[PDB]
Amino acid sequence: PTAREENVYMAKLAEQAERYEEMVEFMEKVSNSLGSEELTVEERNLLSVAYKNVIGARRASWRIISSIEQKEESRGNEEHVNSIREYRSKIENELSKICDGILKLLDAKLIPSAASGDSKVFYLKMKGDYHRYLAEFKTGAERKEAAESTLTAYKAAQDIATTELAPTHPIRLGLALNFSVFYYEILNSPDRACNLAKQAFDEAIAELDTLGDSTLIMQLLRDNLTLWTS
């Protein structure tokens, strides 16, 4: 009853207990203990759910603290603004560290281990996602480079996806969903956003109608598309 095996079981107890930081740790043990083989679909999804929950809690706090700093800076209340920004820096710091940890793991182990179109697009989309979270709060030269790394990763993901995966594939559909959110929200370019989202939705519709979760993601492209045409 192996180390890999027991770490995966612990990661799943951590997921039930909602101790996501521990879940991340157990899955990195798994991931750093692999030779030439890659993570199973189950293991990869466990690592991804762990990081997503560790980063989402901080993104949720960052939005809250940021909406407050803006209301308060708008009433010209300077002492509260310093207190709020200092709180926000603390949070941005945890966001940089969390991203740094999954981005290093992607470049060092995951991406080099990706042997099929499914896993390649999965890890490249992930790489695009964490550089994008860095861009949501960064501001200058830092924002420009996070935005550039984002665009580069999504494009590499889309090249593979477009040619090796079905348009109804959830990973390809999720890539299109996140890539178009990037155009809309980081690049403030609503037109490239709508175009990319609609093309992916249509191609999926086309395939479903001729060749036969992909359902949930498509509802999400539609929800974003209408949200944006407003």
């Binding site: 999720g174 969903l177 996140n178 959110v181 809309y184 929200e185 999400l220 929800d223 949200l227 944006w228």
Partner: peptide, 5 residues
């Protein structure tokens, strides 16, 4: 904020 997965 838009939906992502």
């Amino acid at each position: 904020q838009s939906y992502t997965v």
